[PDB]
């Protein structure tokens, strides 16, 4: 994530500031920083603003500009042409970009919105079923990082302190059984509830950096403001409120609603098991630890060796602490290359088959097949352009293209209206 933080200016900048001291008349310039601070922590020439950007955020800007292509665009300094393409594909997968690369109205909302496009999707979809406070609390948590101090780093694994560690960790799981960042969410506003004086006592029981904790309160107060500015036509008039900062438990239905808004945030950063897509290709059994269970990203390309595509779950991840058969489709914030034997995965939550299709529907990554014929699979056709039909949806790479490796979803009733010769899904029937 990109954030605006007070940081040392360039030396050349500092010289310009001293310059104005003299232009009207020769005078001394004072500097609060010491000279040997100045030599160390300053850059002689300010590093270009363009480099300071997220590249995807640059791509979003030109799309507001309506520029046809970045490679077409003339620039002083190059971002990688391929990396620029990945952002375009990423925006398409998020849904900001149509297959014609023209910026969608959902996309145009983001060029207005400051933060990066991926974090923007969560916030455009956040305002659903009064779940807006939760997503911002999630997003603020994601930006700050992991507050949990793992038992291995603590060195407690003393044994009683493991039990206290486990109990705080059991306390964390109550909001969602299989979800780590919903669980991380469960801590963000849990500390909002506990009083100010008992914060330092709350953190020590939970081993949380209270300095890290308090930021999510400020970020939440900020992020909530920017979102409320954008949602409401009276952008400035909206005010941040402590009561709105306070929020209630997401209902059990809302928990699934949270799962979808996360998947909207990270549509690409998703992985199915290895075995589900290739049953019997690699031996899998319950006795194997959840770390030993392999997963494959859809965005990951098909590889000569399956194990390279295989990615595994983090032991610090909660799902391994459960010790149950994992859920079939997993969603991850990031894949940690650490571990030669196994690539680590931290997962926000389990993502279900049918709900995943909806985010896939929102994105351009999804591919539809032709209608299938079978008992009860007949299709109604009101007008030449529209039918209701059962279509097997294939996420990411199709069966035809072997370059990438996607999983196929089960067929579902859907309404399709012809547009330019193929019939656009109007709603999941």
């Amino acid at each position: 994530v990109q954030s605006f933080e007070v940081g040392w200016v360039s030396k050349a900048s500092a010289n310009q500031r001293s310059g104005r001291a003299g232009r009207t008349g020769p005078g001394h310039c004072y500097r609060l920083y010491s000279s040997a601070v100045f030599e160390h922590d300053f850059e002689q020439f300010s590093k270009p603003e363009i480099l300071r950007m997220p590249v995807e955020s640059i791509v979003l800007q030109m799309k507001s500009m309506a520029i046809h292509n970045i490679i077409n665009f003339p620039f002083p300094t190059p971002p990688d042409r391929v990396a620029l393409s990945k952002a375009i594909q990423l925006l398409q997968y998020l849904g900001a970009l149509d297959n014609k690369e023209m910026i969608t109205e959902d996309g145009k909302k983001m060029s207005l919105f400051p933060l990066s496009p991926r974090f923007s999707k969560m916030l455009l979809v956040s305002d659903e079923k009064a779940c807006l406070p939760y997503i911002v609390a999630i997003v603020s948590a994601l930006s700050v990082g992991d507050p949990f101090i793992n038992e291995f780093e603590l060195g407690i694994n003393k044994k009683e302190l493991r039990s206290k560690f486990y109990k705080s960790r059991s306390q964390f799981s109550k909001l969602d059984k299989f979800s780590d960042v919903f669980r991380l969410l469960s801590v963000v506003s849990a500390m909002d509830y506990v009083p100010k004086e008992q914060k330092e006592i709350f953190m020590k029981k939970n081993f949380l950096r209270g300095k890290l904790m308090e930021e999510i309160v400020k970020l939440r107060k900020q992020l909530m403001y920017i979102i409320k500015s954008n949602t409401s036509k009276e952008n400035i008039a909206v005010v941040i409120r402590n009561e709105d900062l306070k929020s209630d438990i997401p209902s059990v239905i809302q928990i699934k609603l949270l799962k979808q808004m996360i998947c909207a945030g990270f549509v690409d950063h998703v992985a199915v098991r290895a075995d589900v897509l290739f049953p019997d290709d690699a031996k899998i059994t319950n006795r194997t630890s959840i770390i030993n269970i392999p997963y494959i990203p859809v965005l990951a390309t098909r590889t000569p060796n399956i194990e390279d595509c295989f990615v595994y779950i983090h032991p610090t991840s909660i799902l391994n602490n459960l010790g149950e058969m994992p859920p079939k489709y997993m969603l991850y914030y990031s894949l940690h290359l650490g571990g030669n034997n196994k690539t680590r995965m931290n997962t926000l939550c389990d993502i279900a088959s049918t709900p995943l299709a909806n985010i896939a529907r929102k994105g351009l990554l999804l591919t539809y097949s032709k209608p299938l014929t079978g008992q009860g699979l007949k299709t109604v056709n009101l007008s030449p352009t529209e039918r209701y039909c059962y279509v097997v949806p294939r996420f990411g790479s199709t069966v035809d293209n072997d370059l990438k490796i996607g999983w196929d979803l089960n067929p579902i009733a859907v309404h399709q209206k012809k547009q330019k010769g193929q019939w656009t899904v109007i709603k999941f029937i």
């Binding site: 306390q171 909001l175 469960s186 801590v187 506003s189 849990a190 509830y193 506990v194 438990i249």
Partner: peptide, 4 residues
């Protein structure tokens, strides 16, 4: 509270 429920979140504690």
């Amino acid at each position: 509270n429920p979140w504690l």
